[PDB]
Amino acid sequence: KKQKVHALFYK
Amino acid sequence: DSYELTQPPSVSVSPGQTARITCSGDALPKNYAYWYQQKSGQAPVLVIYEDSKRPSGIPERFSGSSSGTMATLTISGAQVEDEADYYCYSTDSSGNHRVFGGGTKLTVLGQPKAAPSVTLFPPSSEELQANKATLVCLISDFYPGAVTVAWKADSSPVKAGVETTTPSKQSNNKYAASSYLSLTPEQWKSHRSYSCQVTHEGSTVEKTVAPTE
Amino acid sequence: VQLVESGGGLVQPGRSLRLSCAASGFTFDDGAMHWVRQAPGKGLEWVSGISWNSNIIAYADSVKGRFTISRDNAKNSLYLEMNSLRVEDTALYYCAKDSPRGELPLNYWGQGTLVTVSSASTKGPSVFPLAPSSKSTSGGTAALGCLVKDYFPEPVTVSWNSGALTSGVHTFPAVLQSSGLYSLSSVVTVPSSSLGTQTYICNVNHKPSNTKVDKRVEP
Numbered sequence: 001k002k003q004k005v006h007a008l009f010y011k
Numbered sequence: 012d013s014y015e016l017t018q019p020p021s022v023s024v025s026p027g028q029t030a031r032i033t034c035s036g037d038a039l040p041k042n043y044a045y046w047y048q049q050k051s052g053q054a055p056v057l058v059i060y061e062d063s064k065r066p067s068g069i070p071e072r073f074s075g076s077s078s079g080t081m082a083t084l085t086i087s088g089a090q091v092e093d094e095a096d097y098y099c100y101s102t103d104s105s106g107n108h109r110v111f112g113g114g115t116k117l118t119v120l121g122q123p124k125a126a127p128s129v130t131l132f133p134p135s136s137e138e139l140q141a142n143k144a145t146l147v148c149l150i151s152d153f154y155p156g157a158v159t160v161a162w163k164a165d166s167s168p169v170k171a172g173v174e175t176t177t178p179s180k181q182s183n184n185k186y187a188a189s190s191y192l193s194l195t196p197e198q199w200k201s202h203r204s205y206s207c208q209v210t211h212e213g214s215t216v217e218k219t220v221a222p223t224e
Numbered sequence: 225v226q227l228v229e230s231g232g233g234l235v236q237p238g239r240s241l242r243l244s245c246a247a248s249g250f251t252f253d254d255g256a257m258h259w260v261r262q263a264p265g266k267g268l269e270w271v272s273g274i275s276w277n278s279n280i281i282a283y284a285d286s287v288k289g290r291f292t293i294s295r296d297n298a299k300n301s302l303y304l305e306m307n308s309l310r311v312e313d314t315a316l317y318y319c320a321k322d323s324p325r326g327e328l329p330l331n332y333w334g335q336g337t338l339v340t341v342s343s344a345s346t347k348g349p350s351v352f353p354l355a356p357s358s359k360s361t362s363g364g365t366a367a368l369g370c371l372v373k374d375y376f377p378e379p380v381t382v383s384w385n386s387g388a389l390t391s392g393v394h395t396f397p398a399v400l401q402s403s404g405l406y407s408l409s410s411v412v413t414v415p416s417s418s419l420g421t422q423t424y425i426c427n428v429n430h431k432p433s434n435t436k437v438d439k440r441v442e443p
Contacts (some may be wrong), residue, residue, distance in 0.1 A: 003042045004061070006326035007283060008106045009256035009275045013285055045329060047268070054267065054333035063246060098268050100329070108285070111268040130411070131365045132354040138371070147354060147371055147409055151394060174407075177265030178306055179397045189396045189409060220359065 014038070014103045016112035018063070021157035023118040030086040032115045034099030036066035037080055044082035045100040046075060047111075048093075051180075055098065086117075094119040118155035124212060125185055127153035131207045131218035134199055144152060144199040146192040146220065148207035153178075163206040164198075225249040225332060227319050231304075232337030239309055245302040245319030255322040255402055256280075257295060257302045258330060261315035261339075262438045271317070272304060287313075309341045311404070313337035344377075344404030348435030349375035351428050354409065358442055361416050368441050369411035374403070375433070382410040419443045 016036040024030040034044060037089040044062050047055035057066055057074035062082065072093075074085045081185045082101075086093055095193060099112040127150045134144035157177040190207060199205075204221040231243040243259070259271040272283045272293040281293055292305040302319055316336040323331045354360075354369035361367075372380055382395050389412060398408035410426060420443070428437040 002040075003063070003102060003104065003106070004326055004329070005043060005100060005102045005109055005119055006256055006273065006322055006329045007102070009273060009280050009322075010254065010326050011280070047330070052418065054335060055330070056333075057328055057331055060328055066331075098236075100268075100270075109270045109273075109282075111270065114267040130360050132369070132371075135352040135355065135371070138350075138352045138373075141350060141352075143373075144348075145352075145371060145407075147369075149367075149369075149396060149409055149411060151396075174399045174401050176397055176399045181394075181432070187394070187396055189399060191399055191401075191407060193401075218359075224357070224359070 012109040014097050014110055016101060018097075018099060020113070020116045021116045021118070021155060022122075023155045024086075024089045025073045025119055025120050026091055027088055030089045030093070030117060030119075032097050033086045034082040034084070034112050035080055036082070036099075036101055036104045039077055039080050039082055039101060041104050042101050044075065044077050046084045046101060047098045050094075058097075058133045065156070090096065090121050091119045091121060093117065107214070111207070116155070116157055122154060122184065122209055125152060125154040125210050126214060127151060127158060127209055127219050129207070129209050130215055131220050132197070133220040133222070133224065134194070139199075142196060144194045144196050146194070146205055146207070148190040148192075148209070150189060150209055151181070151187045152183075152185045153211050154185045156180065158188055158192040159184075159210045159212070160188070161208045161210075162190070162192050163208065164202050165204060189197035218224065227321065227334035229317060229319050229334045232317060232339045234340045234342065235309055237343055240305070240307045241309065241339060242288045243304040243317055243319075243339070244308065245334060247300045247321070250300075250321070252297070253324045255324055256326060258322070259293065259304050259322045260318045260320055260330065262317045264317070264337075264435055269315075274302070294318070297308035297387045306339070311341050312345070313339060315339060338356055342395055342404045344376040347374065347376050347399070347405060347431050348430050348433035348439065349373055349380060349407075349428060351426070351437040351439045353426075353439050353441040354411065355441060356414075356419055364416055365413050366409050366416045366419060367413050368424060369409055370428065370439055370441060371407070371409050372428055374401075374405040375407070375430055376405050377432050378406055380408065381429045384410075384412055385423070386427060396419055404407075
């Protein structure tokens, strides 16, 4: 898909 | 500067018409766009997420799309309560940057468009006697409330010494702004003229003053 | 559900502040929390964020090495330690929270706390007349005014003819200069025929510095 804007905080 | 999302500074729509606000960004093909609405004196509110999804409580007239390097917020059948600043928000693929666009002032027109009244004052004799010089460009009664200001010394653009306010709403719902150019008395007396150029809705008015006046 | 910020204030460049954000009414989910700032009249800027367990932290390039975010869920609090403050850090600072899994980012916002970074000291304004002329004259009316230059802090008030003149008066919002000092202008539109007969005096009050100025404005 596309990356969500705060993805890094949920990895 | 950093990774950038580019929005038009201002969009105006008549009530019932469709408003479109664009957001261009190189990473948009691979990263979702999000949109926030911010009314004067209030915190922002999320209105579109993941390019096209609407949170609960957001009217169906709001929609979003993204194609290539451009995301668009569409408000179909704009209502007066939709007047606000809108911001797009996204990240680059590396996740190094989370950035907002510069914002778009959406005016839902509630009165006729109105060109600004512009008055430019030269440095006063009193200020020169204090070894200072300020040119004063006063801009009032414009609508919608978006303007840009540029200055010239003779025919040449000048940016040094320029301070300009953001537009503020007047009691009559039109807008006001001001711009100041600080110079030394020698600089003022050495040029044939100085000019303030005020642009509103694509229309630029130039006012000029001269030390020999 | 509520987010309430505090800790903002006035400091000189190079000094420090610690912002806090108290959260109420939230259950214990994985939503990340964030600081977002906005300078007066300008756009939003993401500053810093922190995961639910504080394991993941990030900063805007503009504040990296100067700001430190932290979070203590036991006190329902979020913090921002701001060191080596710069004038351009001046802004309203919002705390914000994501919905779970970051599906709705910045779903919840506070009201903001104001941070002002300034090297300015208390100073009364210099006031200069803005004389009416043929160039500020049209349609039977002329514009004249007063320039209120280089004061700190806000606010100033301006009247004309000791309050007897109110019609046609427009006092503009102040500009904040690079010096850290403010300036504003007040103008009045009057009949051009009155320029040779009616005296115009602006009365400027800057109570913070205990200064008052009366300036006659002549053609």
